Design an enzyme around this catalytic site. Structure first.
Site, short mmCIF file in Angstrom:
data_model
loop_
_atom_site.label_atom_id
_atom_site.label_comp_id
_atom_site.label_asym_id
_atom_site.label_seq_id
_atom_site.Cartn_x
_atom_site.Cartn_y
_atom_site.Cartn_z
N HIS B 100 -70.17 -52.04 -8.90
CA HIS B 100 -71.34 -52.08 -8.02
C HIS B 100 -71.38 -51.00 -6.97
CE1 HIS B 100 -70.32 -56.13 -9.53
NE2 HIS B 100 -71.60 -56.14 -9.86
N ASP B 201 -23.06 -50.08 -17.80
CA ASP B 201 -22.59 -50.01 -19.19
C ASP B 201 -21.94 -48.67 -19.56
OD1 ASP B 201 -23.88 -51.49 -22.28
OD2 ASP B 201 -21.94 -50.61 -21.77
N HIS B 204 -20.69 -48.71 -23.45
CA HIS B 204 -21.50 -48.47 -24.66
C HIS B 204 -21.56 -47.00 -25.06
CE1 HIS B 204 -24.94 -46.84 -22.44
NE2 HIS B 204 -25.61 -46.70 -23.57
N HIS B 209 -23.59 -44.20 -28.68
CA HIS B 209 -24.01 -42.79 -28.70
C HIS B 209 -23.00 -41.84 -29.38
CE1 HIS B 209 -27.50 -43.98 -26.47
NE2 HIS B 209 -26.78 -44.41 -25.44
N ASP B 358 -30.48 -46.73 -28.21
CA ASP B 358 -30.44 -47.94 -27.38
C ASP B 358 -31.46 -48.99 -27.74
OD1 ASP B 358 -28.27 -47.40 -25.48
OD2 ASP B 358 -29.57 -45.77 -24.80
O1 LIG Z 1 -25.48 -41.53 -20.25
N1 LIG Z 1 -26.34 -42.43 -20.28
O2 LIG Z 1 -27.46 -42.20 -20.78
C1 LIG Z 1 -26.03 -43.66 -19.77
C2 LIG Z 1 -24.72 -43.89 -19.33
C3 LIG Z 1 -24.36 -45.14 -18.81
C4 LIG Z 1 -25.32 -46.15 -18.71
C5 LIG Z 1 -26.63 -45.92 -19.14
C6 LIG Z 1 -26.98 -44.68 -19.67
S1 FES Z 2 -68.12 -53.21 -6.33
FE1 FES Z 2 -68.42 -55.09 -7.43
S2 FES Z 2 -66.49 -55.42 -8.48
FE2 FES Z 2 -66.18 -53.61 -7.28
FE LIG Z 3 -27.48 -45.73 -23.96
#
Ligand SMILES: O=[N+]([O-])c1ccccc1
Ligand code: FES
Ligand SMILES: [Fe+3]
Ligand SMILES: O=[N+]([O-])c1ccccc1
Ligand SMILES: O=[N+]([O-])c1ccccc1
Ligand code: FES
Ligand code: FES
Ligand SMILES: [Fe+3]
Ligand SMILES: [Fe+3]
Ligand code: NI
Ligand code: NI
Ligand code: NI
Ligand code: NI
Ligand code: NI
Ligand code: NI
Lengths: 194, 437, 437, 437, 194, 194
Positions: B100, B201, B204, B209, B358
């Site tokens: 509006h 982590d 992991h 990886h 991941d």
């Molecule tokens: O190296 N990384 O991408 C990573 C390492 C640890 C935790 C999460 C990601």
């Molecule tokens: S001006 Fe009416 S909903 Fe935004």
């Molecule tokens: Fe990872």
């Protein structure tokens, strides 16, 4: 054919010029040749022959780039910060790394073997006006990726390429650029070669 | 919700990553009361600049005011509730609703109402119809956070013992810049699956990886196959009262980046480390050029070195909108900044070859938490348990002597459980009185 | 559900457009007890003709009987519950279930049962197994409505003071025809978002549709940019006891149609207006050739002039199946009828260039009602508040002196709240005793 | 949940095929306590062989042990809950988790933990972290079933009076083999819609599959159009205490297969029937070469003759993952085995020309059970009611004298209702004391 | 090739004739020419050059029609009421209106700029047997439309066209007809040029 | 072009050989001819002329096969049980049966009439090196099936065909093989001719 960007308010100057390039660059022989090239390239990728693709279809000077463009107002002039993030922006060595990762037997994501199917359409080609060994190529791609019983992701892209003729008859990719059309893909990741 | 996490945060019910009603409850506790990452000064550097951020499932407009301050507002018109702004970022001194035509200032004030004189008269009080404002906005060295709960502790207090670990990179390095725009992608996992992975982590990396380590030859190749600890030592892991925590892998300034990034990055970091040792001491200067992986409670994660900044934006119990930024030190050469920005996306962005690994970790954990029998299985966070310390002379907070460890998982889930069992900040504080003991 | 709408229907909780449990509750109150649009005589003109309609989330077969009456039945076999009919319209004297072959008459009776003699014998009583019938079927000048609740008021009473405004076009013009088939498309918005827009949103036309006004040069260009009221006057808006309401923009017989439709339509309407003035008086003859935008409570909307008939068929709390018909006056030349039919779809059908504008209004409002913080924001329906009248000499019902106004929003939401707080019609009536005061 | 099925299983509320909360309740009663089909010996014939099966919504790894036994485990790592195995079948002596590298034996034992010596020490007890085991695993002539409830009756007792009907094909024919892999496809119907169809829907064949009968010239052409009963007689239908039931169409050894399969199959079956008559008697030898359609409660179905084995794996209240295997008699020539395997998929696999007919029966029934008004319609299971017998000299169980009948629907739904109203097996038994009377 | 509609019970007389038209009308040169034409047209639309499309690719006498067909029983003879609603049925002026609406800076829906990607396949062409300047063209289209971060709509259509050769060498659309295959599209709207 | 399967670890020996076949078999004339053939075949199927397809496009010796491959570990050698189930494996008579079922007026699923749209791309062809009347053909297909107002299913496949030239000039399908890429299709059924 020429686009009047004053009247055609939605068209970027970049897209207008590029349309003209490909319009005047039409050549029947070239269209057939490039269509074959892209079909071969897509087949090779579909069967996951990444090493063969990188060696035979990709030039040493490759720039392989896929961007995600931040959504900006069509009227918001002042904000000039970079509007594009590089999902890919790879030279040859960086592609080599990605290819190695793909074929490593300890790539857990690749087991069981993923299924790829690529659909290439709307191929348009034009010889560069300066460097005649350079071929400008535009093509649209649907890429279907299936794995793990019920995971299915479909990607949609326009690839803006420069390819180069090689002594001996081959043709190799020197640049691929994709402006990925979905700002937030709902595909888990974009770890596919477009 | 009372026994979803056990004493000392030792175990968690797998159901927490899949339960629909618990997600709704998290919106009411976790996202309604905690500090949530919005943006960096460097992304809204000029008056009128704005970005659109998520705070839990809600969307806010975060705007640089004319006086240099920052305010944020729910992205919802006060008339009929249409979303106000559709651009992700921009510059504007006002926002007009496309429905509006109500016009708001960048300060959230309702300034213009079409047909006000002719049809509204005194039936409208514009002062009562400003955009709904986020009541708490604070920063940590340029990194701006928001909170829906006016009763929240100051951001610096909320960071608790984690702030000390962040300072070498965030405070003493001469300023950081967040490089936009972020990568964005939707992943079919619960927000907590990412949060626990980044909070601690280290375990992991060598396994998940393995292939990426072999291919890119990251400095993390030392722990490939989880065969050997790093030659530098096991590292550290810490956690804090309000749930934030992180691991430290000594010296790994290049982090998850490939070999082509290592020499130039290591040279830059080693050079500043030598300068910093004189200002903040040897240990803290070493932290500056070490790899920290952490989570700022609840859903903002970071890596230093391979400098990344992440937001796990919840969509539902098995869906998360994952944001990925790079950050850089302001005094890096501009070419190095660009190389870092691309390298972050290359490893952990939407097309990142590490982060792709991941997906199945996160997604299947979350999907198993939805399944009837499987949801009753406990996750265990026992690595390093019984060996954490508090009040160490050198390292503050609750601290374990390995970045391959679950010290920070335990602290994250302890804080999580305290919040889901609490109605407000006072109750959280009561539930956290003996957090370290 | 008690305080979702405030006194005088002045404000509404945004949550109403997104809440899942409230949707379930609406099926039990709103759609189970109110009159719902089925079809027009002109779409089932001959014995055996049928159409498949939705009544809330349920589907019914609406059938022209051999004696000329109309009956409607749930589209569900009484054996194992298979859907009976899959065509959207047709002609048939019976309906056979594709599962086991039970055959029903167009009167809903179970007529044939394969193996009845051999296997059923007296184990079956066909008289007890007729299709489940809609107990109330009534029409308003050819427009046929159904109701699941046998206790509902007669349709004419339910239309209340709204009927007077409808009569010039619906009753006195010589009969209307509904032109099928309707456009159908799914939109990710709550059914109420469309219902409130059509019940009285004159305010949005000049703003939302600014571009469409400029392009097509509709008579509504007068209010483009919400800069000026129409030169004809502000118009009227009305509401009624059972929730139906509408706005009147004087003289705008061509409505949302483009310039190419204006001369021929205006000539036809002006010609009949002159005839009608003698039968029903000047004011009512002017209403005949004016633009009315309204909603017949709960989810049937219409425009006169740019003659459209809409059903907002609920799918879930953020999903609606939108039906779009054109209607014509029976004595229009056949070419004009065809031009009108196409023009309706051109503006507001699935590919309509006006209605496309509206998607983001409706959809984001609904999606914001799902978000935790945003859902607690009120929508305001204050335009014209404090200036409505009842018992005016010329105009019946509760009436405001502007079609750019929220008189009819307030009445719509008043009736809505009365229903969601009530278990039956008796309770609704008690809750509505002082509806106008 | 108390009155969803009426006395004698005569009627069922249509809502049972669509209600979300009831689905959740089924996971707790039906799938948590009953016997569920896993695999056949022939698919895991060697030590280390495994398949991945569903048990309700959960997934299990079913593994051939080194000592020749079979054990099954939830497919979930005991560390952080990642899914352990991603292949559908294989051979392995252990399973390694891709997240952190924990290694389990094919016996579910946690055998290896990376960094155990360096980082865990005595903070880990591997004996306490074995995969979560399915406590009951039993077979019926090579067909292996699992049960989450240790209190369940032995599988043979659970099959009750149904076992006698299965024995000619399953026991006395010289052994069956299950031919993998199964066809798999997702269908938008409730698991019960398929289960009731296979348990006793002889009635649908002649009508639903009229076109397929005409095209393929199956022996079932005799009942095409539901015009005449089979010249062989009406057949039989039976049901049993724990819910399993089936129909018998005399002599129809080629079942739903087309004419090209009939001569060779009939010759093979007639030849063995003559041998079998000497061992097990005329009637039972005839059952051997008859068509049985049945369901082994709750969600495992089969056809003999046109030998198929089905699992209706629940995904949610309107979504089922449909598995289709063929089975063969071990002493069939290998070419015939291959022809049978393809013929099963040809009729009822994902591209089966019969099963495609069924989709709309199943799917619309289920979708109607979700709709507010339609969900209150009863399904009726009255065919043959009042004529069933118990303790017949020749045929055990509750038995009706027609395979076109609803005897087995009534028994299936009786058992279903007893389970949903019960907290455990003891309560089910109490609710089933007079099941046949 | 001819279809026997007595034996081929699912085939309409209309579709049977039309198949025959395109079978006998095959010409290699024409196939290449029309493929180029449709690729150019789709590129122009993808970059949102609607004015250039309307001026250079669309003839003044255009009828641009997309219908949604009511689902009727294959055996229900008696019911003769109109079975098709015109989602589009536009002459040149009506397309002009729609194009203007598209490029108006106050078209709120177009901000931020929408992304379109068109995939054109299965091109078949035949010269009209009477009017040789008229080219009958059939082609299938997948149209992907992305906006507002996570909105994605995919359209699927067969375009049945008549194009006309112009003095000077151009070719312009005189009729496009689409029988849209989904009765109730789940795409929010169908406001795209198919 | 040749793929080194020792270095290209993801590529099957089957796929590698097949890629080479189609690479060296490229012929411009054949590409055009087969493209026309597959477009005609797809049109015929889209209009549901199944009898005409079976009579004129399918050879008496047809094997029409679509498999679903069980997902196996890329490193799990020992397990040798059959890894493929035949969703279709049809000879001519079996196709005749399926075609009859399709056109029977009592096929309840076919009422109201279903809508099919097929997109054929990436056509590659090669004459057999022994049997020159045999044409090896590879093509990718997207098949969109819509019915009953809001049911939409999209299929994605690579068809590996052998076609045979007939005396008189026709070309008929002697084998079609599809390794269907989604292990568990989420399409209700796969009752479509790929
Ligand atoms: O190296 N990384 O991408 C990573 C390492 C640890 C935790 C999460 C990601
Ligand atoms: S001006 Fe009416 S909903 Fe935004
Ligand atoms: Fe990872
Ligand atoms: O003109 N319109 O389309 C319209 C006008 C008012 C309310 C709703 C729709
Ligand atoms: O023949 N059949 O496929 C069949 C027969 C009876 C019940 C279920 C299926
Ligand atoms: S479900 Fe309709 S006849 Fe059985
Ligand atoms: S989740 Fe399996 S080893 Fe950690
Ligand atoms: Fe509007
Ligand atoms: Fe069936
Ligand atoms: Ni470009
Ligand atoms: Ni090579
Ligand atoms: Ni046509
Ligand atoms: Ni021009
Ligand atoms: Ni092959
Ligand atoms: Ni023929």
């Amino acid at each position: 054919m020429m686009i009047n960007t004053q009247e055609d308010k939605l068209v970027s100057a970049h897209d207008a010029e590029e349309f003209h390039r490909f319009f005047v660059g039409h050549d029947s022989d070239l269209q057939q040749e490039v269509t074959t090239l892209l079909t071969r390239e897509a087949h090779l990728l579909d069967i996951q022959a990444y090493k063969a693709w990188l060696e035979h279809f990709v030039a040493p000077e490759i720039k392989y780039q896929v961007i995600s463009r931040e959504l900006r107002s069509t009227s918001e002039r002042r904000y000039q910060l970079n509007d594009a993030v590089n999902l890919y922006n790879e030279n040859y060595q960086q592609l080599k790394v990605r290819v190695e990762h793909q074929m490593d037997p300890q790539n857990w994501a690749n087991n069981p073997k993923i299924r790829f199917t690529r659909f290439v359409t709307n191929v348009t080609a034009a010889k560069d006006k300066s460097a005649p060994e350079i071929l400008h190529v535009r093509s649209n791609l649907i890429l279907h990726r299936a794995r793990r019983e019920n995971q299915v992701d479909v990607f949609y892209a326009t690839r803006e390429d420069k390819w180069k003729r090689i002594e001996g008859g081959g043709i190799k990719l020197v640049e691929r650029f994709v402006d990925y059309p979905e700002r937030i893909p709902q595909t888990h990741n974009l770890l596919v070669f477009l | 919700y009372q026994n979803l996490v056990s004493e000392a945060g030792l175990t968690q019910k797998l159901l927490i990553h899949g339960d629909k009603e618990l997600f709704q409850h998290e919106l009411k506790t976790i996202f309604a009361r905690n500090w949530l990452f919005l943006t960096h000064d460097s992304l809204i550097p000029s008056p009128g600049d704005y970005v659109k951020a998520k705070m839990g499932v809600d969307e806010v407009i975060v705007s640089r005011q004319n006086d240099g301050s920052v305010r944020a507002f729910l992205n919802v018109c006060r008339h009929r509730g249409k979303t106000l702004v559709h651009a992700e970022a921009g510059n504007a001194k006002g926002f007009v609703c496309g429905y509006h035509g109500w016009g708001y200032g960048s300060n959230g004030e309702l300034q213009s109402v079409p047909f006000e004189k002719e049809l509204y008269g005194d039936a409208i009080k514009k002062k009562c119809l400003g955009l709904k404002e986020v009541p708490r906005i604070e920063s940590f060295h340029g990194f701006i956070y928001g909170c829906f709960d006016a009763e929240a502790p100051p951001l610096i207090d909320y960071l608790g013992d984690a702030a000390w670990y962040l300072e070498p990179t965030f405070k003493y390095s001469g300023g950081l810049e967040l490089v936009g725009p972020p990568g964005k992608v939707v992943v079919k996992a619960n927000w907590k699956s990412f949060a626990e992975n980044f909070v601690g982590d280290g375990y992991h990396v060598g396994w998940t990886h393995a292939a990426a380590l072999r291919a890119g030859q990251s400095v993390f190749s030392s722990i490939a196959g989880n065969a050997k600890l790093p030659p530098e030592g096991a590292g550290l892991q810490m956690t804090s009262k309000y749930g934030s925590g992180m691991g430290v892998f000594w010296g790994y300034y290049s982090g998850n980046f490939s070999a082509d990034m290592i020499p130039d990055l290591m040279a830059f970091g080693a050079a500043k480390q030598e300068k910093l040792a004189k200002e903040i001491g040897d240990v803290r200067a070493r932290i500056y050029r070490s790899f920290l992986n952490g989570t700022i409670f609840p859903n903002n994660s970071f890596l230093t070195g391979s400098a990344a900044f992440r937001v796990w934006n919840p969509i539902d119990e098995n869906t998360t909108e994952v944001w990925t930024y790079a950050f850089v030190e302001k005094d890096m050469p501009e070419d190095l900044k660009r190389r870092v920005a691309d390298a972050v996306q290359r490893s952990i962005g939407p097309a990142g070859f590490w982060e792709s690994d991941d997906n199945e970790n996160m997604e299947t954990m979350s999907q198993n938490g939805k399944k009837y029998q499987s949801s009753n299985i406990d996750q265990i966070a026992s690595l390093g348990f019984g060996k954490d310390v508090y009040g160490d002379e050198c390292y503050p907070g609750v601290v374990g002597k390995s970045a391959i460890g679950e010290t920070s998982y335990r602290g994250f889930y302890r804080a999580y459980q305290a919040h889901i069992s609490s109605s407000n900040w006072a109750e959280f504080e009561n539930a956290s009185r003996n957090w370290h003991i």
